[PDB]
A paper describes a structure:
The bifunctional enzyme Δ1-pyrroline-5-carboxylate synthase ([name]) is vital to the synthesis of proline and ornithine, playing an essential role in human health and agriculture. The [name] molecule contains two domains, GK and [name], catalyzing the first and second steps in the biosynthesis of proline from glutamate. The GK domain catalyzes glutamate phosphorylation, and the [name] domain catalyzes the NADPH-dependent reduction of γ-glutamyl phosphate (G5P) to glutamate-γ-semialdehyde (GSA). Our results describe the assembly mechanism of [name] filaments, in which the GK domain forms tetramer and the [name] domain forms dimer structure, and both domains form specific interaction interfaces.
In the P5CSGlu filament, no ligand binds to the [name] domain. Conformational comparison of unliganded, G5P-binding and NADP(H)-released states shows that the overall structures of the [name] domain are similar. The structure of the NADP(H)-release state, which has no bound ligand, is identical to the unliganded state. In our models, unliganded, G5P-binding and NADP(H)-released states represent as open conformation, and the NADP(H)-binding state represents as closed conformation. The interaction formed between F642-P644 of the contact loops in adjacent [name] domains, which appears as a CH/Pi interaction, is critical for the filamentation. In the P5CSGlu filament, the GK and [name] domains are likely in a stable conformational state, while vibration may occur in the [name] domain of P5CSGlu/ATPγS and P5CSMix filaments due to the binding of ligands.
Author numbering:
A (entry chain A), B (entry chain B): 347 to 776
Write the structure that this text describes.
Amino acid sequence: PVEVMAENARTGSRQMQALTPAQRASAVNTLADLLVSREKFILDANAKDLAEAQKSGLAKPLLSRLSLNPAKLKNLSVGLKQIAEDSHKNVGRVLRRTRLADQLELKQVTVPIGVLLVIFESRPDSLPQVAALAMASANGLLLKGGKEAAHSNKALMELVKEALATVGAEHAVSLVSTREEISDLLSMENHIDLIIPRGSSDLVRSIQQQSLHIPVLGHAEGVCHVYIDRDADLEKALRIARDAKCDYPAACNAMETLLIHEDLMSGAIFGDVCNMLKREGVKIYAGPRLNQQLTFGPPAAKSLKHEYGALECCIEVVPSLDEAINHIHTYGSSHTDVIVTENDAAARQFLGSVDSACVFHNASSRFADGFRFGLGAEVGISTARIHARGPVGVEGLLTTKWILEGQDHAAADFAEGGGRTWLHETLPLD
Amino acid sequence: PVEVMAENARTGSRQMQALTPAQRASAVNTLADLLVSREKFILDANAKDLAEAQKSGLAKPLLSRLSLNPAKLKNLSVGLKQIAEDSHKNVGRVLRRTRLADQLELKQVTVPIGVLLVIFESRPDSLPQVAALAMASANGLLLKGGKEAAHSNKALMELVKEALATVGAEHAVSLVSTREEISDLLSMENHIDLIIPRGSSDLVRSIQQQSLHIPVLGHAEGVCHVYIDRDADLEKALRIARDAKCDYPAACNAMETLLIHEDLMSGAIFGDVCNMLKREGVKIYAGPRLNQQLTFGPPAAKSLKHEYGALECCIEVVPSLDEAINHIHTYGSSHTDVIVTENDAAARQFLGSVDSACVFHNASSRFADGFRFGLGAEVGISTARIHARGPVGVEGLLTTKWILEGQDHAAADFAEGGGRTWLHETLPLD
């Protein structure tokens, strides 16, 4: 059925909960060994499914993305080994050690979350990565593919189930049928905790709209912003904008705006940046203030909160820093915002005023990739304002659970009737 | 209006965001000085509103709770001073310091959340506590009273606005009218972040049901459980159960069940515990297994997942530890579960198997009060499975915000084209 999936997943979570030292590490190690030693199967299956899906011709993104090569499998192998090696102290780690009275020691610890539900469009390289993340964060996990990558998905699922059955001995990983009336599966509760979308803009949008009363990690928009201050080296700003837009224009955190200090427009920097974008072939719009600025110029931007993905980038100009800050707050989706300058003052102003999910300074807006932060293998880009924000490592999958080991204590024994005191001496946390 | 409330609150949040060292501490200090020096006003106002609400006779809980005495104001004063003294490093604290390459140092920091919405039934002693929590966690804050405590609420709001206008100079605290079509205000979004209910079971229930697409802290049920193991001192279990149930039977974390090891039923402990509860006057039910156990016994429990609040407590009996664990998982709302014993083995079994919000061992289920954990002044009892679990201090009001201060770096400059490396050396976090 459908619900027995989630129930058995929860049972398997309770199962895996108690093996931490060197067991789940060896489990994900063996998953890597499977992924390197049994590559013929998934390879031929991906060949079959791509050849089949060619004739339907769904979309160039999907039909170009669901490919799979021995190089990508080598990449998955080394990534799984990485998770294995740096995933030794994720479950059971303590966060506090307090003493309240004689022989009563509080300590808050780490636990799984529960039954994660991963939702992605056909992308058969994710599946082992997210399964390794599950097995290293000890929580059970469901999955949900698409219409394509079906046979590849089933092959990889059999692979991960084999790799998991070695130690732990219980299969808490699953998969659901063709779209399984996604609204129905989503409306469920008491079973699943985190809808982790992974597909694309359309998918996360439909999710956040349909999902009611269940926490949904991930974002929906990627409207960056790149404020070029008045005390920034010119070619510096040039290369920053170039490397921000001209590397993965369809990515989730690529600049879809570029504000400029109105003072600096006098130094022909506008001409230079337009020349650069034109050399790179980008259809630029203009902003109402810039629209008013020059003679006839580029077309008028439809909406300032628009998302292009292709090679398009609005350009507006603001008088003062604080106006730029207000602009970013009003329009930007608080995802990823930068600033380039050589002044420390404006740097502190920005980095302490803006409320994005992550703010840079003279860096490039294409660093928010999780892997680059030295943050393991990231499982999403959280923009939600609770529990996770920016790139989420695996620690975006672990809550807390207060435990307490007294001897004989009681509740009102600490009132005037009983002679018990308070210390609150923070012990050395392990 | 209603929305301009939230917008101005957000502006005030951005305002207060940048004063941390000794300023907000002095602000909440001065709030305490107001609460101690201007007590006549709120006192007479509470007198008036209680005298008025007497004639309507709404409910004994409310009409007994909205009282207010100089002793309670002394309590609020010392609590606000406590928050002041231990609230010095809540905003701006760093959590990581990483180095990725030459002169590019990541660091994840602490921030407010946004526009908190506190919802409580008439309880005019909370208002200054939650306003102090706001002003010490730097985030703006709305409020929502009830039909009673109205004049008291307005008096205390004027008081807190005076105290806040000293430093910060912007009023980011508000209040809304009589129930303001709670569904309307709740349906809002893009403005408010945390519905923090504080009233009672009915209130949090109506909230969690009505609230769609907005994070809601707090719980809805308090079904504890007290498993008395087979190697526990008898009078120990006696006093543990007594102090668990017979201190605040209407509280949110008072035992509403008591499982016993079927082996220990042979030692007349059942007779003793029933005698104790009877001496304390508690209408006990029985559990299906206990129902089958004895001759005619106490009545049959209607539903095992019931909530009494008054002096009633089911009693069931389970054969083996693991069966007790499964029982707690199936029925209990994972709020607060204990275990009494003298065996270390079963202790580890329990404390590592059960997935409640907090698990004790030989302690009393009436410790989960926030204040007792050495956890400041608690703002709720989180049972939600994200961002907060168990008693939430003020740290349940602070997310993270990755910042990044490089010199000249770029995105594809770290591919094969540019000679830049990776270090990931975790610097000493401040």
